[PDB]
């Protein structure tokens, strides 16, 4: 088996590690299946790409029968199989079996804490955000190892990319000195960012 690891927004190529001369393709059956779900097939030299792939996949025939996924989605992660069957004498026989695993990275970039001045006396408002990551993020504000209370927070997922965007608002008093940390936890991973205030 071979392991490929690309980042959620890259292109990924999964090689069948084998090829078939054009003269042979016609009497060949090639199945690219993930788990036991069909990615696409070529039979009688005719194509068939499944819905979930119908548009972001290129079957690079001449290059080791490999597939090229252009819009990596977190779901694309998994174990792919390339089966090649060639009809011989009495019937189709397996000519090649290939297995590849795809790892999609989708870490959240360092969050950005920006502040704005509101009409309130010395009450300041800082917004923390970060997006384009997976899985689902969980924000939290910390001053001194103390889990604060934010005004508003929202987490959303792009219905097409599967990626998440998080953002949150928190207010504090500009009088005292403050040292805030916006900690985001997604899966067994975490990434934050600290904002500092002084006099």
């Amino acid at each position: 088996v071979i392991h490929v690891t690309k980042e959620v927004k890259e292109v990924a190529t999964l090689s069948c590690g084998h090829n078939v001369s054009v003269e042979e393709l016609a009497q060949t059956r090639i199945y690219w299946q993930k788990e036991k779900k069909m990615v696409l097939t070529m039979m009688s030299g005719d194509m068939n790409i499944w819905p979930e792939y119908k548009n972001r996949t290129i079957f690079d025939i001449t290059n080791n029968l490999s597939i090229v996924i252009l819009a990596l989605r977190p779901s694309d992660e998994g174990t792919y199989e390339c089966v090649v069957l060639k009809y011989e004498k009495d019937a189709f026989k397996r000519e090649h079996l290939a297995e590849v695993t795809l790892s999609v990275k989708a870490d959240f970039p360092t969050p950005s804490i920006s502040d704005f001045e509101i009409p309130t006396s010395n009450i300041r408002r800082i917004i923390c955000s970060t997006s384009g990551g997976f899985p689902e993020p969980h924000l939290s504000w910390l001053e001194n190892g103390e889990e604060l209370n934010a005004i508003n927070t929202t987490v959303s997922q792009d219905p097409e990319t599967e990626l998440y965007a998080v953002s949150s608002k928190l207010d504090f008093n500009m009088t005292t000195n403050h040292s805030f940390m916006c900690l985001i936890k997604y899966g067994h991973l975490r990434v934050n960012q600290t904002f500092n205030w002084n006099t």
Binding site: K36, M38, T41, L85, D90, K93, R94
Partner: protein, 118 residues
């Protein structure tokens, strides 16, 4: 895919050895290819193979040593002309060829005991 076959089978005075190979069809079969492998010294060797359309009598070739019959997720393999010298472990492999997805199954191999008459 899981494939089950008898652990041991002894041949006959002649040279005929039989056994049932049963596979776990996870779906609409249609095209299944059955292969009998002989393992020895950890070196595999095709003994015979055949593809049958789920719904037809498994039929091997003439070039072939084996012979068999199918009944649902079951196959009736019968090897022949075995000399006590080819006694050993006979793995039975099963493939779900069409329609895809492709599934592969390897049994543990039945141990065949054959003895060359006096």
């Amino acid at each position: 895919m899981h494939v089950a076959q008898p652990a041991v089978v002894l041949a006959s005075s002649r040279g005929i050895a039989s056994f049932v190979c049963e596979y776990a069809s996870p779906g609409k079969a249609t095209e299944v290819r059955v292969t009998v492998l002989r393992q020895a010294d950890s070196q595999v060797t095709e003994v015979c193979a055949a593809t049958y359309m789920m719904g037809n009598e498994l039929t091997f070739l003439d070039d072939s040593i084996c012979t068999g019959t199918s009944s649902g997720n079951q196959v009736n393999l019968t090897i022949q002309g075995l000399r006590a010298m080819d006694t050993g472990l006979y793995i039975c492999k099963v493939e779900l060829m069409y329609p895809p997805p492709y599934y592969l199954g390897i049994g543990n191999g039945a141990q065949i005991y054959v003895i060359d008459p006096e």
